[model samples]
Target: KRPNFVWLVSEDNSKRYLKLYNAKGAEMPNIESLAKQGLVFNNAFSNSPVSSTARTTLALGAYPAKLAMEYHRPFERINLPRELSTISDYLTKAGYYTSNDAKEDYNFVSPENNWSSSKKGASWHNRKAGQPFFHMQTWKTTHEGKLHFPESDIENLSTIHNPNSVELDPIHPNTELFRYTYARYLDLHKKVDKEMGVVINQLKEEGLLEDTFIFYFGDHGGVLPGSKGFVSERGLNVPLVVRVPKNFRHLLHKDLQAKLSTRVDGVISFIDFAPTLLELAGLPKSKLQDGESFLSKNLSLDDLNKRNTNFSFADRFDEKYDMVRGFRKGKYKYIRNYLPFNPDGLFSSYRYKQAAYREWKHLFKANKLNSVQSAFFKRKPLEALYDLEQDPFETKNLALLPQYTEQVIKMRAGLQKKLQSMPDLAFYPESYLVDIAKDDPIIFSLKHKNDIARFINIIDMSLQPFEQVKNKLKAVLLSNEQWERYWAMNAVLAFGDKANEFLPIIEKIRQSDINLINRSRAIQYLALNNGVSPQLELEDLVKQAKDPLTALAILNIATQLHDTLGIAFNIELNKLWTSMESFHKRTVDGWFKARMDYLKNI
Candidate 1:
C-alpha cells in the first residue's frame, strides 16, 4: 500500500507574491494551513524560470540546459532520449495511476502510455480500484494572462486586494498603473488560494486526505514585468509546501511526527522534484535522472536544510535572444549575462501585452526614466551579485563592489563549472544548432564541451577590471575561435569609452571577423563608442542576416542607436525579410512578427 501523492501546481507565481512567504503579500490562509500541517520550503527555486523550460525540467527531472530544452518559445518538438522517461512513466510502473489536469507544455508530445488519464476532470478518482495515485493538478486561472482581465473582473477584484497600499518592486517605478496591476496580481493569488482550497476540501470530503501526501508548488516565477523571463531571483524563486501523510512519516525518520507546520529553510531546485516524488512513492529512480532524492530515510531536518546550492540559466526567452546563467548559495545570488549588451526589455510580443511594460517602454523613449527604473531598457553589465536578505529586489548590483569580490569570484567559478559540465549548447549560435544538432543536442553539446568552455572563460575574463585584463583581452580579440573573438569584442564594449586604446583592434574586427555574428558586435562597438557610423555595415548586415538571432541582435543595436547614428533600418530589414522567404518560406518568424512594428513608428 504505497502512499498517494497529489501535486498542486499553480501557474506563474513566485514565493515573493504570497503572504505565507512574504508578510506584505496577499494573505493565503489555505496555503498557510498547509504550511502549518507540513513542511514549507523557504528557498525552492524554478531554475529555468520560463514556462516551457520549467515544465520540461520538472517532467524530465534534469537541468533543461543539459537537454538543450532551455528556450521559452520552443520552436520545434524536442525528442527526448530513447532511454529517458517522464514522471508519469515511473509512477505508473509502480502501480500508481498518473493523471494531469491538462497543461503539458513540455514542448514534446510524450507517448499515450505516459499517463493513465490527462484532462480537466482527470483525477485519482478515475484510477482502478485499490490503486494508489500520482495526480498533478494545475491551476491556470491565476496565470499571467488572467491579469489581462475584462473591465468587470477588474471591478469585482476590488474586495480581494487594495491597489493603493500594494508595495511595488523598488526597481520598477511607482506609477498608478503599476499599483493597480500589482493589486490585481495579488487578487489573482487569492483566487488561486481559493481554488486550491476547493480541491483540498474535495480531497478531505472523499476521505483521501490521510492517505495522500499533498505537495503544493508554483510552476515558476511571478508573471509581472521583470519576473517571468529574466534570471534574477524575482524571476525564478517559487513557493513549495509539502504535507506528508501521517503513515509516510515513518519512511523518513522512525521517531518523526508529521503534524503541525514545519518550515525548512534550504535551497532546493525543480530538478530534484521528480526523483523526490519517486523516493516518496517507494520506487526506484532512473539512472538517467540527474538528482538524488531530497527526502531520504534517517535524514535529519538539519540535513535537509544543508542542501543549499542552486543554479539557473535563461536563454532565448520568446523572440528575444540572450544567454544568462546564475548561481545561488544560501543568501547570495550571482547573475552572469554572457551577452552584456543584451538588455532585458528587448522587443517581445508577449512582454508588451501588459500595459505596464508598454508604459515602461514609452517612458524610457521619452527620457523620463530614472536609472533604476530604466535598467530594463539599457544594456546589462557582464556580472551582478545580490544579497537576497538585504536586497530582495536585486536592484543594487554588488558584483564590482570591493568587499564582495570573494562572493563574486566563488559564484563565477560555480557557474562556469556547471556550464561546462552541462556542456551548455547556447555556446553555439542557436540557428546553427537547430540544423546540425537538434536530433540529439545533449550528445552534440557534450561533444563540443571544450569549445563551450572557451566562451565561458571569455565571459569570466570580462569580470576583471578593464585595465587589468587589457593584454589578455587583446589576445582573445584576435583569437581563432569565432565566439572567443565575439565575446572579446563584448569585453571591450563593456568598458565603453575607457577602452579607446583598443580602437585599432576593434576596427580590425569590424572590418573582417570570421563570423558575421562576431563581426556585427565589433561594428556596433565602433559606432557607439568610436563615432564610426554603422549605416554601411547595417546594410551589409540586413542583406546577409538569415539567422533569426543574427537579425534580432543587429535589430536590437539599431533600435538603441536609431538617433545616435541617425539611421532608420525598416527598409533594410524589409529587404532582409524578402531574402528569408527563399529558404524559410514556411517558417513563422516570431522575431519578425514581434518587431514588425518596432522601427515602423521610429
Candidate 2:
C-alpha cells in the first residue's frame, strides 16, 4: 500500500559548506532541485558529530549515552540490550527488501542478515517485482578524506567555485591554502552532485521517482579544520531534506508533511530517523526505541516546538583523548570541554592528514594568526558559550563575558541536566571502558550512572570562583577514585598559581597516588601551574607506567610543558611511547611521531 524508502547519505559534509544552507558554500544543483519539492530541516543535527558514533547510534535508534557507546572507535562496537533492534532489522522483518552500499559502521559485529545484499554496488533495482525496497546509497565524494587527498587528485577536475573569492571562517586566518582547500572541498561536492544527478535521472526514467520517499542528508557535519571531530555547530548541525512520495503524504501529519517551501526551521535529529521511516511504512514502533517518530500520524505542532534543543558528544576520536559535550538550544550553543588542557591542535594523527591542518598549525606557531585565530592552539576554556546567530563561527566566548553571564549559566545548567540524566561513558577512562565493559557497557554504565553524575558535578565546580571552592577542591584531590583525583588536578591546573594554596596537597598526590595516570597528572599541575620542573618525575613515570592511556596522557602533558614551560623530555617521552605496546597502533604511532617532530622543531 506504501512506496519504497531510499536514503541518499553523503559522507563528512555540513550545511556550513553547502550553498543550500550558506551563500558562500558549494553549489549542489541536484540537492537544490530536490529541495524545491521536499522539506529541508533547518535545525537538524547528528548528535554524535563523528562518523562511527553517528552511524552506530543511528543504526539502532538508541542514545549513545544510554547505551555507553558514545566514542568514535569502530571495528568493535559496544554491546546493547537484546530487545533492541536496528532499523535494518525492523525493515527486513516487515518484508521490505533492504540493501546497503558497503558502509555498515555500527561498531558491533554487523549481523549476517543485516542486509539482503550489502556491498559497493548494492541497489534497490535488484529487488523482486512489486516488493517495496529499503535502500541506502552512500556517497563518499565529499568525505573529509577526499578534500585531503593528494592535491593532485583534484588538480584536473574543473571547479565552479573560485578559490580567491571564497570567504574563510572568521575564527581561521585568511590563508591561500585554506581558501583554495575550501573551494576544492566545494568542488568535491559538485562531483557528488553529478553522481546524484545520474541516480535521480534513473529514478525518473524508471517511473519510480514519484513512488519513492527520498531522503538526502550528511552522515555527520564538518568539511573544514576545527569543524571535523569537534563538538561545534559546524561539526554536528548537518543538512537534511526529505522528499516524500505524494501517496505517502496522506500517512504523514499535515503539520510536518506540508512542512515544505524548500525549508522548515524544525529540529529534526538523526535519532528520530529510524522511527520516522518505520512510521512512514505504517510499521510497529520498537518498544526499545529512544526516538519518537518526527512524522508520526498523531504528531502535533506542539511536539515539534519542544525539539528546539540538540545535544552532542566528542569523545576519544582515535588516538586523541578529550571529552566534550555540546548543547544547542535555538541560537545559543554551549561546548563543555571536560579536559580543557588538551588543546584542539594537540597533534591528532588522522586530522593532520589535511594540507590545511598542517598549514593551520604552522601559521599559529609562526605567530601568523591574530588573537582570535590563535585560540585553537591555546588552552580552551573549561566551557564556551556562543550565540550561533551572532557568531556562526563561534569565535567569541560569551561564557566569560559580563553581559552574557546569565546566558552562560542557563546553557551550563542545561548541559548538567543532560549529563546527570545518563551514564556518559566519557566520565570513565576510555581504556577502562574498552577493556572491562566491552561485553555490555550499557548495563555497567546504568549501575554507576549516579556516581558518574557526582564526579561530573565535581568537575563543574572547577569553573567556579577559586577562593570560594578551594576547600571543596581539596576533598576531590584527596578522593579514593583515581579519575576523581585526575580531574581535580585539572581544576588546579586551570587555576594556575592562583591555586598555590593547594600545592602541598598536589605534591602529596604526585608522591603517593597509586594510579600511574593520576600521579603523572599531579606532577603536570605542579609543572604547568607553578613551573615546578616535572622533568625527572616524568622520566620516572614512563619507566613505571604500563598502560598506554597513562603513557599517552604523559606524552600530551610532556609535549605541552616542553612547548610552554621549556622543559625538554624527548628522550624520556620516547622511552615511555616505545615501552607501551598500545602506542604502536598506527594512529598512536603517528601521533607519537607527529608530536615528537613538532616538539623537536620548536
| Pairs clashing within candidate 1 | 36-261
TM-score for each of the candidates: 0.89, 0.90
Worst-scoring 10-residue span by lDDT in model 2:
575-584
Model 2 residue runs over 4 Å out of place are 149-158, 258-260, 300-306, 535-550, 562-602
Best by TM-score: 2
> What lDDT tens digits, residue by residue, belong to model 2 across residues 161-219?
88888878877778767777888888888889889888877887998877888888899
Give candidate 1 misplaced runs (Cα > 4 Å). 107-112, 149-159, 254-257, 363-371, 465-472, 500-505, 508-514, 533-536, 547-567, 571-587
Evaluate model 2: give its TM-score: 0.90
lDDT (C-alpha) at residue 156 in model 2: 63
TM-score of 1: 0.89
How close to the true structure is residue 387 of candidate 2, measured as C-alpha lDDT?
Answer: 84
Task: Give a tens-digit lDDT track for model 1, residues 163-240.
Answer: 788788876778777777888888788888999998888888988877888989999888878888887887788999
Prediction-by-prediction clash tally: 1, 1
